[PDB]
Amino acid sequence: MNAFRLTVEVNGVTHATDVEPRRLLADFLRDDLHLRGTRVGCEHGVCGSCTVILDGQPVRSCTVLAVQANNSRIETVESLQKDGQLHPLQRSFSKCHALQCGFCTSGFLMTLKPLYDDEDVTLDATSAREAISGNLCRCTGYQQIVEATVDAFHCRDHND
């Protein structure tokens, strides 16, 4: 029982706070940082929603103690939209109706983000399925998600 002084940059914003070590990063991000965007479904790195960008790499915010993120950059689904506009991924996710409840949306979107931002590769239906596969959904059947991701990557590259 002795709190640890943590320093983390969330969505560009720096933070300084005492946390007890045992607090999971997911719960840290939701409380008191009050970014409910990150969602928790399973409890052992499966569900997907959990997923956040840590230092450029998508990792589960739920198999990582908050204290382990000290002096590191973290990005959540909150950081996608910039100035009212929805980031291309979100825009195409709506264009193809790639979501129904909401839970498996932070997870997929953040998994797809660095993949998008880096110039390669294309994502075709087959390679698209393998990409999102690290995230589970109980509403869409992925069919539309797989269709959604592909659309996002066409307006990206071969754009007209």
Partner 1 sequence: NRQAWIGQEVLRREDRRLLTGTATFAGDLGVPGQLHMRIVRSTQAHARIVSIDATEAEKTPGVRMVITSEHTRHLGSVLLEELGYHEIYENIEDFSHPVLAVDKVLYVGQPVVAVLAVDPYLAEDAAELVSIEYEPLPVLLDPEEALTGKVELFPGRGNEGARIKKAYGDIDRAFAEAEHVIRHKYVTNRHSGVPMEPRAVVVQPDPARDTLFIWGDNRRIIAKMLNLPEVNVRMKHVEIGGSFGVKGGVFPENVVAAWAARTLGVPIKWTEDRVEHMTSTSHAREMVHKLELALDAEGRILGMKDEIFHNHGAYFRQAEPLVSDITAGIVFGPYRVPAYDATLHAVFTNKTPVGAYRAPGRYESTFARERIFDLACAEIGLSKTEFRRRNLLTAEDLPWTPGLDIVHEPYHFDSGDVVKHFNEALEAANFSEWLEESKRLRADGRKVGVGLGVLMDKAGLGLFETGGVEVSRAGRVTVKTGGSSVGQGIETVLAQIVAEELQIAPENIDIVHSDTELIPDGVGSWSSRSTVLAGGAARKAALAVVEKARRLASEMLEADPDDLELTAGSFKVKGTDQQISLYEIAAARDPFTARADNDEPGLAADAVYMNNAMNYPYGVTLVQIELDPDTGGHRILRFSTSTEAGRVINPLTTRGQIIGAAVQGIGGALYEEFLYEEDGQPITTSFMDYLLPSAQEMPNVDCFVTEDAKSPDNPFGAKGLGEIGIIAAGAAIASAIDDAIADGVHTDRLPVTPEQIFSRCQGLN
Partner 2 sequence: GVPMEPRAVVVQPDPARDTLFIWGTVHVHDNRRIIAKMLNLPEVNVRMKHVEI
Partner 3 sequence: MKPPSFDYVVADSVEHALRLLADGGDDAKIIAGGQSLVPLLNFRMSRPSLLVDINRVPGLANIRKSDQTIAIGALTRHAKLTTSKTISQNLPILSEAAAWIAHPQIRNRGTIGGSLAHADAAAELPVVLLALDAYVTAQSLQGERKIPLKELLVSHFVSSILPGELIVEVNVPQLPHGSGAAFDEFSRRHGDYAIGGAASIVTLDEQGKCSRARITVLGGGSTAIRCQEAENILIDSTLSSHDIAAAAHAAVQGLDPVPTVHGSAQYRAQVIRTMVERTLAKALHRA
Ligand X SMILES: Nc1ccn([C@@H]2O[C@H](COP(=O)(O)OP(=O)(O)OC[C@H]3Oc4nc5nc(N)nc(O)c5nc4C(S)=C3S)[C@@H](O)[C@H]2O)c(=O)n1
Interacting residues with partner 2 (CB under 8 A): 39, 41, 47, 49, 101-104, 136-138
- Please say whether the beta carbons of 95 and 88 come within 8 A: no
Give residues 30-49 in contact with ligand FAD (rule: CB under 6 A).
44-46
- Shortest Cβ distance from residue 50 to ligand FAD (Å)? 10
- DSSP string of 51-113, one letter each residue: EEEETTEEEETTSSBGGGGTT-EEE-GGGT-BTTBPPHHHHHHHHTT--SSSGGGHHHHHHHH
Directed axis angle between helix 125-132 and helix 143-154, to 10°? 110
Among 8, 29, 59, 123, binds partner 3 (CB under 8 A): 59
Task: Please report whether residue 85 would count as binding partner 1 according to CB under 8 A.
Answer: no
Burial status of residue 131 (CB atoms within 10 A of its CB: 0-12, 13-18, 19 or more): middle
- Shortest Cβ distance from residue 97 to ligand FES (Å)? 10
- Cα-flanking dihedrals φ and ψ of residue 60, to 5°? -80, 125
Closest CA to 54 of 69, 41, 71: 69
Give residues 117-146 in contact with partner 3 (rule: CB under 8 A).
133-134
| Closer by beta carbon to partner 1, 50 or else 119 | 50
Residue list, annotated binding site: 42, 47, 50, 62, 101, 104, 137, 139
* Contact set with ligand FES (CB under 6 A): 26, 40-43, 45-48, 50, 60, 62-63, 99-101, 103-104, 137-140
* Contact set with partner 3 (CB under 8 A): 1-2, 4, 20-22, 24, 43-45, 51, 54, 57-60, 62-65, 67-68, 70, 111, 133-134
